[PDB]
Amino acid sequence: GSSGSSGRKEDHARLRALNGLLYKALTDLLCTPEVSQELYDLNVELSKVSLTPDFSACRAYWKTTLSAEQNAHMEAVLQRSAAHMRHLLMSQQTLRNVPPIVFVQDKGNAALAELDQLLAVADSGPSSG
Known part of the structure; x- marks a missing residue:
């Protein structure tokens, strides 16, 4: 956007x-089982x-572990949690x-x-309607 x-x-x-308020408030939801018990047990921040x-x-932006499999698990649950975080x-x-x-x-x-x-290439259609 911002076209004019x-x-x-x-x-x-x-x-x-407003971004600073969102940062504290999102981090506070990562710090509670109220968004997800699994997300809280994974101890993401x-x-x-x-x-x-x-x-x-x-x-x-979220802090990551040495294990790429555990990172993909945390990423999937944290992305699933996002719509409920928006509602909260x-x-x-x-x-x-x-x-x-x-x-x-x-x-x-x-x-x-x-x-x-x-x-890309145009379709070689007929001249007639």
Whole structure:
């Protein structure tokens, strides 16, 4: 989005404050069995959260183990938990519309991936209607 106009310095301050409130509140739900008993027993905790300037999505970053199989198990349950976390945070009176929560591993995009090509061809249809 953001296809026209531009936000003020106070809009960036509002985004940063609201993202900080989402960070504490999401981390508090990871710290309770009220979202999931399994998620609470796995003892997962966030490192940070990032909110889009469009208000379109909330990327939540979680701390990982040495085991990739245990990481995939934690990631699957934490992504399953996200819709219920959104509903639990929707009890706040001031935040009219809680953004969709999406879970992310703590490692950043430090290199551009092995992305595939894209190609297309038009249909050789008849001239007649």
